[PDB]
């Protein structure tokens, strides 16, 4: 039944439905590497909680995290692992089994389906323009721009919200909220809010920076 472990994150934020390399740089987490391949090559990543400690304890960890798949494994003799992943869906844990290693008994997945995408079509472009005009105008975030020809034709809120969260950067608390927010509509809402805040934040900086220009 696809049993999963409880592997937390250290300093990196991993978004669901997004290909991102995973760095396992913990020496004491190597014991989870061999059992990750022993669970039908399924690895479960827990988002970065309260500052990371090297004490393995179920009470110090949480049941909310992202699920990752293993394609290939390439190793170095330095205690750090590079694995490329492609998240399928968020997986929750109901009953935690102490280890070591900490084993988790999975349950039915929290999946969603698109119904009546007519409103979703307008929401997609409304959310798109907010950061499309931001990155074009504001450049301190330094995100890529030559993927518009391929992302415009895709209509999938679950993937696109996590992709936009992966691209832009903001508070890690709401980042990991998006990682483990059941309400995908709330993910889109907060993403749109943050884009609007960043837009007005850059306009304030430009006018106040240009205000200082006029002052000098």
């Amino acid at each position: 039944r696809l049993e999963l472990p409880v592997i937390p994150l250290r300093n990196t934020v991993i978004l669901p439905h997004t290909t991102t390399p995973v760095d396992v740089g913990r020496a004491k987490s190597k014991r989870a590497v061999e059992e990750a391949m022993g669970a039908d090559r399924l690895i479960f990543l827990v988002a970065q909680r309260d500052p990371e400690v090297d004490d393995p304890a179920p009470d110090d960890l949480y049941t909310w995290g992202v699920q990752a798949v293993v394609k290939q494994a390439m190793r170095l003799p330095d205690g750090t692992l590079q694995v490329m992943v492609e998240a399928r869906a968020r997986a929750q844990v109901t009953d935690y089994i102490p280890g070591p290693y900490l084993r988790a008994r999975g349950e039915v997945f929290s999946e969603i389906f698109p119904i009546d995408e007519a409103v979703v079509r307008v929401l997609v472009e409304e959310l798109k323009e907010a950061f499309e005009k931001y990155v074009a105008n504001h450049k301190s975030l330094r995100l890529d721009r030559y993927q518009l020809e391929a992302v415009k034709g895709t209509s999938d809120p679950a993937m696109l919200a996590d992709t936009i969260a992966y691209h832009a950067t903001w508070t890690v608390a709401e980042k990991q909220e998006i990682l483990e927010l059941t309400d995908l509509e709330a993910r889109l809402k907060k993403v749109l809010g943050l884009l609007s805040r960043d837009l007005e934040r850059f306009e304030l900086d430009k006018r106040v920076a240009q205000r200082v220009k006029e002052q000098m």
Binding site: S196, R197, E200, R201, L204
Partner: protein, 72 residues
């Protein structure tokens, strides 16, 4: 948007101190005192207080008037 801007307006003094002062906890005193908004603060008085909070730290260094307004 107002509250988010509140936080970033304080982060403005944090930015102007990134190079000015080694630490910024002292100017973070009123930045944490921003809880005034949550404390009662009926809507109009809350807005007036936020206006008086965001824009009265004119000069982080020296500046008796700025410190005067800070103590105010």
């Amino acid at each position: 948007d107002t509250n988010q801007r509140e936080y970033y307006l304080r982060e403005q003094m944090k930015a102007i101190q990134k190079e000015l002062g080694g630490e910024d906890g002292l100017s973070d005193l009123e930045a944490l005192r921003k809880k005034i908004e949550e404390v009662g603060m009926p809507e109009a008085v809350k807005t007036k207080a936020l206006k008086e909070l965001d824009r009265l730290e004119r000069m982080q260094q020296g500046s008796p008037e700025a410190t005067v307004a800070r103590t105010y």
